Amino acid sequence: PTINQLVRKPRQSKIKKSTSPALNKGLNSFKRELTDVNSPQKRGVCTRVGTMTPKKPNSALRKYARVRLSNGIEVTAYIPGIGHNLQEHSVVLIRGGRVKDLPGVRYHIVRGALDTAGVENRGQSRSKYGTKKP
Amino acid sequence: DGNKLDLEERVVTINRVAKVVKGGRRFRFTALVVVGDKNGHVGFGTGKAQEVPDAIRKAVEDAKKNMVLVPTVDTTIPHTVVGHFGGGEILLKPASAGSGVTAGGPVRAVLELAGVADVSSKSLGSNTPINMVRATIDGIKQLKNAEDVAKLRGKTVEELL
Amino acid sequence: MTDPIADFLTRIRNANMVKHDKLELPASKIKKEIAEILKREGFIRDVEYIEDDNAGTIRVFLKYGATGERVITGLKRISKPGLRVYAKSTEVPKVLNGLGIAIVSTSQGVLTDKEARAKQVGGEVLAYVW
RNA sequence: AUUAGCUAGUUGGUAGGGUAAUGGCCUACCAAGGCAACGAUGCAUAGCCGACCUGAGAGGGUGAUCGGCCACACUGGGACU
RNA sequence: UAUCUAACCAGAAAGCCACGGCUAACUACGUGCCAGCAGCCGCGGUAAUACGUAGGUGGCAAGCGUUGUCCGGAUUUAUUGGGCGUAAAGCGCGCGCAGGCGGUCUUUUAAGUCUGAUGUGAAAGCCCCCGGCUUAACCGGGGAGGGUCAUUGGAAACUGGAAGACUGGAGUGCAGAAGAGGAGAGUGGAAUUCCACGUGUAGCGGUGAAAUGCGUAGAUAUGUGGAGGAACACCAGUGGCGAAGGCGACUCUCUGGUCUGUAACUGACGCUGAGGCGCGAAAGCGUGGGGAGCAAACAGGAUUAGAUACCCUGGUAGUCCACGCCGUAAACGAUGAGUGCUAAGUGUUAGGGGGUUUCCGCCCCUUAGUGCUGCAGCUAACGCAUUAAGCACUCCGCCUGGGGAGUACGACCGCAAGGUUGAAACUCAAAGGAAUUGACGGGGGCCCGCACAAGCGGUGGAGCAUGUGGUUUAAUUCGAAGCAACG
Ligand SMILES: [K+]
Ligand SMILES: [K+]
Ligand SMILES: [K+]
Ligand SMILES: [Mg+2]
Ligand SMILES: [Mg+2]
Ligand SMILES: [Mg+2]
Ligand SMILES: [Mg+2]
Ligand SMILES: [Mg+2]
Ligand SMILES: [Mg+2]
Ligand SMILES: [Mg+2]
Ligand SMILES: [Mg+2]
Ligand SMILES: [Mg+2]
């Protein structure tokens, strides 16, 4: 462009989207108005639990839970690891992370933080999946 | 110049590459290889063969025939320069002594095997090593010595200085 | 139009390309200054000025080394109408760490970067020469 | 600018009173200006800086702790000392 | 409390992540597109270094890893530092207010620029030099840096302001030349259809075949005469003009612009041009005419598995005009306007100049166009190449991954159809351009083979033998499965 063009309008960079929009919103009951606050993790209440058929190429059933977070946003969270404790009205803690197999999931459930009891029988990567040392 | 020296070749990329027929694919390998002597000379070559070493040696054989010189002034190139071959856009800036060469593999190889010890660089354009190396040599073709430039103009080195 | 000096530098480039021996262009004071300066620096075989009905004309005889080697690799303008460049004695940079040269027009007349350093002046960076 | 008109003590002046003090600070009278595509007006956002993190540098983001300044003490207004 | 002295004890003090590539570090079992893994690419369907576990290894280590956020890498908003022929990107084109930018010279200034001095930009923090804590972190001392900082004093090269002067830009004049440039009015004959009248007898039309349809109430054709409208062969040509859309029969009127030559005249009067104003193919909309042909829709007949289509026969809107709206386009040279510079060859158009010659005719030089091929140079390539996609400068418009989406909200316009401006959520890991190798082709070309065709004799029909399938079986062993399994 010409310099006069660049002065009449300077540049404008790209509008960045977050991987994790719902972690980046807080709530106050008083105002009843969402408040932008960068957050790593949120807790919620499992509305629904179920299985998913993932994309091509894959075919295994994937465990998800539809959660209502603390801030009121309804979110689908993958339940990683072998087996789980969860059911309806179960409280859950939620971190970000995208299940590439599965279309509508963008977040994971931290395993071992709350009523998400740790995985059974696991020995390796225990800090993930939330088993104590035996 | 020529195949008349002891040299220090280095292989940059070896790309398996496929011609295709009614009977499917007839894979071959390409080898781009940089030859030099750290007392100052460098050159790149390419070769093709169904085998890794065959391609390597053809590349060496083209390299030893398509070489050039680069000035090594005070462990640095004499001045800043840019090469522009195709999608290759690669600038070379000198740097302070003892800093070391600062570059990616396919350009680092060129400058090291010439023996230039202290240079900065940055790939601006494409990342394809063939065009990167064509860019490097297009650049270090542009480089000039102070004595040569004085001989052109009619000046003295202390007068350019 | 809007640029005599750029026309001058570009005609010199375009004659470097074809390796013409001479190149004639309408003249002005600044053009004559920069021709003088290139003759001082060692880029021009010779320059001579000519009278005409309009404005006077200038002719540059170009300088090549042996084997038809070029002595001018490149010219360039920096301070332009749409954007000018004004630099100090400290902000004029050494073209190619001193292999090439620049032109800075200052209070002490039109000069090079090195002369402008010697006189500790500054002003319009009119041009670089690789 | 998916906000272009805004202002009416608003702009200037002559008198007057008022403040620790100049001034439409306020009052009366006269004229009808003044600002604004160099973005006024309006909406949303935000305490500002030294500085902090990053970066070759230009620049990008932040304004925890430390220091300076500003503002506010449940919300609003008002004075006394 | 630190600190210091002795005594006693290896004794009580190591865990986290990963090991397919990107990236350091591989084996065994178990599982079997299940369970599960995953930052990107991607693993797992019975032999998994990619899942789980064990061993071993790598990286770190009193921390390791994941998540969230910020910079960089990302030249992916490019001042430094990008681009728009085909990839995203040139408003469809113009007229032009504002702004940006501006030919050559002299004087004047000092708005911008440059420069010496003074003052300040706190301490802490970054940086450098010393010192102190068992070093380190940390802490102290000193210095430095940092401002489009301000005042004051100087220079006039450039930009800017001012007063003059000049002409290569720009324009007027003067002498010529071309032209489907536009609007209006009128006008011509081909030629389709229709009306009448003769001659005139059984078909015509159309298709891959047909049929629907017209025709003895007389066609089809053939001649004569008349009515009506629409478009204008030859000329006519990568030829002309126009800003573009676009403009082809002729004449007249009213008009615009272009080029050539001169150096007469003014003397930078100019280039672009946001926001505005207008024009703007075809379709379409309102009112009123006209309506011959062609023809969306529609009807009938075929086709087809079906055919809401190609195909046939008919046929309304429309197409045409006046006026006014609509303002879109593969509106395209998919290439913004302007200026200058940088090899050639050759057509073609409109001009001028000169040499020769009886004009004619040939030749060369030059101006503005229009086309072909090509050097440098550019380009990812294809290709562009004095009609640049080259080298440079001014100005405007526009792009920033695909889709959603040119959608939604909002505003403006519009009678309406709808147009202009123009997002996000969400989703993907690509989308795409050019070119290469093949393969294919209800594309072409050339050549061959019992491949066809030409012929001979056969199979499929009958009975039996054999093999295979399906089935029924205690079992009817297993394998082979288009050509290339099935005596
Ligand atoms: K007031
Ligand atoms: K109509
Ligand atoms: K067209
Ligand atoms: Mg606030
Ligand atoms: Mg950077
Ligand atoms: Mg296994
Ligand atoms: Mg495009
Ligand atoms: Mg300080
Ligand atoms: Mg129409
Ligand atoms: Mg036969
Ligand atoms: Mg039989
Ligand atoms: Mg069998």
Curated annotation (Swiss-Prot), chain A:
Domain of life: Bacteria
Matches recorded under SUPFAM superfamilies: Nucleic acid-binding proteins
GO MF annotation, one: structural constituent of ribosome
Entry keyword set: Ribonucleoprotein, Ribosomal protein, RNA-binding, rRNA-binding, tRNA-binding
Compositionally skewed regions (Basic residues) per UniProt: 8-17
Biological processes per GO annotation: translation
Cellular component annotations (GO), alphabetically ordered: ribosome; small ribosomal subunit
Coiled coil regions, renumbered to chain: none
UniProt-annotated stretches for the region Disordered: 1-25
InterPro entries referenced in this protein's UniProt entry, alphabetically: NA-bd_OB-fold, Ribosomal_uS12, Ribosomal_uS12_bac
HAMAP family xrefs: Ribosomal_uS12_B (MF_00403_B)
Function of the protein: With S4 and S5 plays an important role in translational accuracy. Interacts with and stabilizes bases of the 16S rRNA that are involved in tRNA selection in the A site and with the mRNA backbone. Located at the interface of the 30S and 50S subunits, it traverses the body of the 30S subunit contacting proteins on the other side and probably holding the rRNA structure together. The combined cluster of proteins S8, S12 and S17 appears to hold together the shoulder and platform of the 30S subunit.
NCBIfam families documented for this protein: rpsL_bact (TIGR00981)
Protein family: Belongs to the universal ribosomal protein uS12 family.
Subunit comment: Part of the 30S ribosomal subunit. Contacts proteins S8 and S17. May interact with IF1 in the 30S initiation complex.
Name of the molecule in the record: Small ribosomal subunit protein uS12
Organism listed in the record: Listeria monocytogenes serovar 1/2a (strain ATCC BAA-679 / EGD-e)
Gene giving rise to this polypeptide: rpsL
Curated annotation (Swiss-Prot), chain B:
Tagged with keyword Hydrolase: no
Entry protein name: Small ribosomal subunit protein uS5
UniProt remark on domains: The N-terminal domain interacts with the head of the 30S subunit; the C-terminal domain interacts with the body and contacts protein S4. The interaction surface between S4 and S5 is involved in control of translational fidelity.
GO BP annotations, alphabetical order: translation
Annotated signal sequence range: none
Recorded family membership: Belongs to the universal ribosomal protein uS5 family.
Keywords for the protein's UniProt record, in alphabetical order: Ribonucleoprotein, Ribosomal protein, RNA-binding, rRNA-binding
NCBIfam families: rpsE_bact
Domain S5 DRBM: from-to ranges: 7-70
GO MF annotation list: rRNA binding; structural constituent of ribosome
A single GO cellular-component term on record: cytosolic small ribosomal subunit
Assembly mode: Part of the 30S ribosomal subunit. Contacts proteins S4 and S8.
Entries under Gene3D superfamilies matching the protein: 3.30.160.20, 3.30.230.10
Transferase is among the record's keywords: no
Record-linked HAMAP family: Ribosomal_uS5_B
Native source organism of the sequence: Listeria monocytogenes serovar 1/2a (strain ATCC BAA-679 / EGD-e)
UniProt-listed Pfam families: Ribosomal_S5, Ribosomal_S5_C
Task performed by this protein: With S4 and S12 plays an important role in translational accuracy. Located at the back of the 30S subunit body where it stabilizes the conformation of the head with respect to the body.
Swiss-Prot record, chain C:
Domain of life: Bacteria
Pfam families recorded: Ribosomal_S8
GO biological-process terms attached to the record: translation
Cited Gene3D superfamilies: 3.30.1370.30, 3.30.1490.10
UniProt-recorded Gene Ontology molecular function terms: rRNA binding; structural constituent of ribosome
Annotated keywords: Ribonucleoprotein, Ribosomal protein, RNA-binding, rRNA-binding
A single GO cellular-component term on record: cytosolic small ribosomal subunit
InterPro entries in UniProt: Ribosomal_uS8, Ribosomal_uS8_CS, Ribosomal_uS8_sf
Family: Belongs to the universal ribosomal protein uS8 family.
Role: One of the primary rRNA binding proteins, it binds directly to 16S rRNA central domain where it helps coordinate assembly of the platform of the 30S subunit.
Subunit text: Part of the 30S ribosomal subunit. Contacts proteins S5 and S12.
Name of this chain's protein: Small ribosomal subunit protein uS8
Natural source organism: Listeria monocytogenes serovar 1/2a (strain ATCC BAA-679 / EGD-e)
